[PDB]
Ligand binder design. Structure first.
Ligand SMILES: CC(C)CCCc1nc(-c2ccc(C(=O)NCCC(F)(F)F)cc2)cs1
Ligand SMILES: CC(C)CCCc1nc(-c2ccc(C(=O)NCCC(F)(F)F)cc2)cs1
Lengths: 190, 190
């Protein structure tokens, strides 16, 4: 029934914002009553937090999997496989992505979740840049953590604008190539 | 008295969010009554829209001024002078920047203002990249408008995270050099 509430919420978020979804809407979709809903989640806000937590951990575990089983390809394709984790994971859950980013403004728990994982993904990015510099493949230009931070924030803004069809945005079918170019040139360029 | 209302609002936004500022707060600061406030602005939301409109046009007119009077320096310093318009203009009005970005979620007029100017700044960016390619200084890699869009969105997210001291963020004293590196490598890199 927890899974039914979560699937109901993800389905309804494709049609309307969390503000237009009632606890009664979530309960009906999961085949339970309102007070029975409160046995599983304290609020509709907690439901979105759990949905975002699932998608964020999905992306994180995919990047951990790549990290353990390196692809046998050139540096451009290495970075492309990493960015693609986020493109495919968040782009496969557009309504949770959209609603979760909007909740950053109003939910300390959402803001803290997003902050925690971005710090982790930025640290990992910087560690890989540092490894590329140590082996002589990348030049020692900017501080690696500072470069990693700007590239990770570029991807957050640019992928999510693309998925939402914002004006302006890179077309979704061009956004991966766009970001790979900017990561590879900025990491390997003198 | 319009200028007094606007100065009052900019001052109060340094201490608290627009949600915690009342029309009565703005009126008191400008030395007028509540109904007299409504003679100048329909809402506190319109006051923020005007503040954001002023800062956005300040940045736009600064970039127009640079465009007319080119600086006599290398390509890295050219791009640095352009990014610096946004760093100095928005970084000199941090409370309006913060409040204006937050209002994008709730105000169609704010969202449309921000969208309109980003389109203009992206078009100008793409026109300069195209000129650099035409003269043989930049290689024909990505579509220039797509590259321009991702670089402009990177700057929006990265400058505003820096000004807000978000975790994560590039330190404010490093953010200009960080962005200049990524623009120059991605625009001139093969
Ligand atoms: C083959 C193995 C060793 C992977 C090596 C390539 C790597 N890629 C990354 C990386 C991290 C973050 C993001 C990124 O997109 N952040 C932003 C996340 C989001 F959601 F905000 F967009 C994109 C790539 C780090 S190392
Ligand atoms: C010497 C003359 C000819 C200027 C040539 C250098 C140029 N610089 C730009 C440019 C445009 C936008 C931004 C930019 O930061 N956008 C994002 C704005 C904001 F506010 F969202 F951060 C940054 C530089 C375009 S051509």
């Amino acid at each position: 029934r927890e899974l039914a509430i979560l699937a109901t919420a993800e389905n309804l978020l494709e049609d309307r914002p969390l503000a237009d979804i009632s606890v009664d809407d979530l309960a009906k979709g999961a085949g339970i009553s309102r007070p029975t809903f409160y046995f599983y989640f304290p609020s509709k806000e907690a439901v979105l937090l759990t949905l975002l937590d699932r998608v964020v951990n999905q992306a994180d575990m995919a990047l951990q999997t790549l990290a353990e089983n390196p692809a046998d390809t050139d540096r451009e394709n290495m970075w492309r496989t990493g960015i693609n984790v986020f493109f495919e994971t968040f782009g496969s859950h557009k309504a949770v992505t959209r609603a979760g980013q909007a909740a950053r403004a109003t939910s300390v728990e959402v803001a803290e979740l997003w902050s925690t994982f971005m710090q982790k993904w930025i640290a990992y990015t910087a560690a890989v840049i540092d490894a590329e510099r140590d082996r002589g493949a990348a030049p020692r230009t900017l501080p690696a953590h500072e470069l990693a931070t700007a590239l990770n924030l570029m991807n957050e803004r640019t992928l999510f604008a693309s998925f939402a069809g914002e004006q302006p945005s890179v077309p979704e079918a061009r956004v991966l190539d766009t970001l790979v170019h900017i990561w590879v040139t900025s990491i390997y360029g003198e």
